[PDB]
Amino acid sequence: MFQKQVYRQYTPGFPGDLIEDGPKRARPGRIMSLSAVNPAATATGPNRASRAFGYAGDVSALGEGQPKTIAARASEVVIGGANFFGVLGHPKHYALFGSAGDSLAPSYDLPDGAEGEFFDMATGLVVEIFNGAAAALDLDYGDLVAYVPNNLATADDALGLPAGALVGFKTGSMPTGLVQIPNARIVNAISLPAQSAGNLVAGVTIVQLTQ
Amino acid sequence: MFQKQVYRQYTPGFPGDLIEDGPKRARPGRIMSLSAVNPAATATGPNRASRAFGYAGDVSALGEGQPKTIAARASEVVIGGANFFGVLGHPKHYALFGSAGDSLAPSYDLPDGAEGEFFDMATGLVVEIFNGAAAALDLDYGDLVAYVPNNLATADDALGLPAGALVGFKTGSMPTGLVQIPNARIVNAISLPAQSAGNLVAGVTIVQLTQ
Amino acid sequence: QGIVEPAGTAVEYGDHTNIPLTSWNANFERRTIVRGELGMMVGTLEEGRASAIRLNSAETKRQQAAIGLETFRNAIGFYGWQSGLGNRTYGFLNDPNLPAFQTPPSQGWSTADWAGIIGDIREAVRQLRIQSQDQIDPKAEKITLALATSKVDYLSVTTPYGISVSDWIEQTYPKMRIVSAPELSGVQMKNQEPEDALVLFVEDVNAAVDGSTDGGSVFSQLVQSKFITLGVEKRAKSYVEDFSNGTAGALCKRPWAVVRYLGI
Amino acid sequence: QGWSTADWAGIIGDIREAVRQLRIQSQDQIDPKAEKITLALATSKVDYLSVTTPYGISVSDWIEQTYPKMRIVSAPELSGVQMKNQEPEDALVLFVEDVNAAVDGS
Amino acid sequence: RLNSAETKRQQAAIGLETFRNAIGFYGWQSGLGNRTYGFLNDPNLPAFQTPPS
Amino acid sequence: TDGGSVFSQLVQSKFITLGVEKRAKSYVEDFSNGTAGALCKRPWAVVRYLGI
Amino acid sequence: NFTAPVTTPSIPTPIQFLQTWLPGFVKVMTAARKIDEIIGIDTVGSWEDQEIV
């Protein structure tokens, strides 16, 4: 939308980009549509970057006759998930793919059946963080993070939250229905304002230590 | 000079040094004077190397007027913090600065406002260990480590343990007032004698795996 | 850096009288050096996709590494680094050996006429001439005016007869140099509004005038390096590069040649 | 508040403030004296540039000599812009024509 | 890295110059009876006055 | 990367001349030397008795 | 079990190194002498003389 203000310095980084170099683990995968989930999904959302994903199944069979050919090792994932399969990242790898209203529009969404890179271990990862309980929250250096499941009950989801959004919380208190990513730390302090249903603040970009 | 005894072998390493090569993580920081803490420090000590340090705040503002320039991303640390930040190490980085009496005197502490490197992950790190139970203790290969906070009550600190010393303990016999470091192991054998207040045996430096 | 400070006094001459002698006495000062770091990483497929839109990914990231380090160095030049914590770095606006800020005769250049603005500069030069006892002549001394970007446009204030502030400055002080900087706009945040600053100082003092072994250099910027390549690490599908720089801040060596105003 | 019922110095201050904003919005990256700035102004207020001091200095002479590269244009669409409580408000727009490639790496 | 002899010699020269300048501005022992006098201390001078402003 | 020797005597100079002053009926000469004592670099190889 | 060192742990590099000394020296300036620019200078007599008439 063009630069309407001149600042003294540039932004540290963008969500989905690695910000520090160190030990790292990532695997490829393919995306399943939410409609294919058998017990139906109570929480829905797009396949947006910088959001958690869950394991779905194995698609390495590649055949239908009596002798099958296993020529590759592949896995497929779902946006919400209950079996953690990393966080989507590295936006420079993919393409715009266009948008519904018009192409050439900014978006982090990815179509179903596309291939992405999901990070399990990362020294520094810029992500988009959310807030729970609809109250002002200060994270500071060492809080934990969790992500919304597909099957989150509507009672525990009063604030409309995406399918796989990342939510930070203090050690003592955690929202009732969430899945905690083991051994993850906030690393970068951040403050978030109060929230309301339908008017959730998107939060601010933040560094992450996935493992 | 100063060598009055001859032993059969060399020491494996010195505290604050890397003893093995592998995955590792470190961050820089600036040390805050312990007197700056508001609720006061019940446990005190110097900024000795191979001691745990805690996050204190952000000092990246770098300005005094209405607009400020965020030139760098820097973190500010204190000798003892509830949020774990790292362990000071790599003594070759710093300068001696002598001592109050005369220069060229052995010193092993850093002054306030100085930089340092703190470790969050290390395959092998030599650190000094302490006994927190005032009794004989044998650690063995697989154990856990913890560090003293400043807000440790004197009732739980009958032994005069320093501000940020590291304490080893068994799986189910952790002291009452310490803070555990997740996924930390001793990965080496060591034995400590009986202990008493005022006659605190400093223990023996031992290898330790941070993460 | 050091100081010389000679001493000695003379008496009347005599054939068989005692001979007076001279001596000296020195002192020293210290500062600290700070280092910065910044790097980059590029993958194989990222470059291929970037070339589709006619953009060089590796070169763009390399340029930002140099720019990011320059911003770190530039900020230290104006404000000290961790001066509150105890680090002895300091900067242009934070040096301890400075004459300290003052309130100008005119309350502010805003809502001030031609006479008010011209009076402020005259007083600053008078203090500079009083402080150094006729050692420097402002007519032919090559003095520098710092000023601020929010106040640099007030030099075009004109009288009803067409005479402007800049006309008087050029004729009275032909060798004066005028600059500006955004970092001098918001300085101390007096009540609820930023306060613009004005710094007047001499660029250099002649060796014959003083006798110092070094140059004049009233203000000096201590830079160890501006851009150093640490190394390149090559991996299977990517490579990483590192860069660094060093600086020590600003040092004021002759505090008697500086005049500064706090409020506009 | 308004160029109407304003003297020569008052009108000059408004033009000075507009030039100051350009040097402030961009952090001292462009100097207005060598940028070929264009002044939009309004039809109902373009005639106020002829205000003169008793000595004989006009507003237009000050602009034409201090900023030789400035261009003055008039347009009727800028007379009634926002249609205030009961009167129209005349607008004034100041902008730079071109930006050099040395200023920014575009 | 400092030469003491050169510094002392320069200081001696500067002190002699200062003495000469002081004698030039103010006379030497004019009250005692010595006839040296100076720019601002000559006994036969029209004496100071006060300006209108 | 040293000569060992356990003990060492640190002597800056044995004999140097300062200057000569000549007078009407005599002259004077001055001399000087410097030393720093003894240093024991390997105290693990010394056995000493106070009596006997 | 880890053996005992024979020397006290310490930071190796003393601060007397790692220092850069600027080549110059700053000298005190004091006031100026300007009698010659006011009244000029003239050589009349010689050293070891007495009076001028």
Numbering used by the authors:
A (entry chain h), B (entry chain g): 1 to 211
C (entry chain F): 119 to 382
D (entry chain E): 225 to 330
E (entry chain B): 172 to 224
F (entry chain I): 331 to 382
G (entry chain B): 66 to 118
Article excerpt on this structure:
Bacteriophage E217 infects Pseudomonas aeruginosa and is part of an experimental phage cocktail developed to eradicate P. aeruginosa infections in Galleria mellonella (wax moth) larvae and vertebrate models. E217 is a PB1-like Myoviridae of the Pbunavirus genus characterized by a ~66.2 kbp genome, significantly smaller than the classical enterobacteria phage T4 (~169 kbp). Here, we describe the structure of the whole E217 virion before and after DNA ejection at 3.1 Å and 4.5 Å resolution, respectively, determined using cryogenic electron microscopy (cryo-EM). We identify and build de novo structures for 19 unique E217 gene products, resolve the tail genome-ejection machine in both extended and contracted states, and decipher the complete architecture of the baseplate formed by 66 polypeptide chains.
We reconstructed the E217 head using alocalized reconstruction with fivefold symmetry imposed (C5), which yielded 2.8 Å resolution at 0.143 cut-off Fourier Shell Correlation (FSC). The E217 head has a maximum diameter of 790 Å and is built by 535 copies of the major capsid protein gp25. We will refer to the reconstruction of the E217 virion at neutral pH with an extended tail that was determined at an FSC = 0.143 resolution of 2.8 Å, although no significant differences were observed in the E217 head because of alkalization. The first 65 amino acids of gp25 were not visible in the reconstruction, suggesting this moiety could be cleaved during maturation or is disordered in our reconstruction. We found that E217 has a T = 9 icosahedral capsid decorated by gp24, a likely cementing protein stabilizing the E217 capsid. Each gp24 subunit consists of two anti-parallel β-sheets, arranged like the petals of a flower, to form a tulip-like structure. Each E217 gp24 trimer contacts three neighboring decorating proteins and six capsid protein subunits in three adjacent capsomers, burying a total surface area of ~8642 Å2. Gp24 trimers at neighboring threefold/quasi-threefold axes generate an inter-capsomer cage. The interconnected architecture of gp24 trimers is stabilized by extensive van der Waals contacts between N-terminal arms and omega loops.
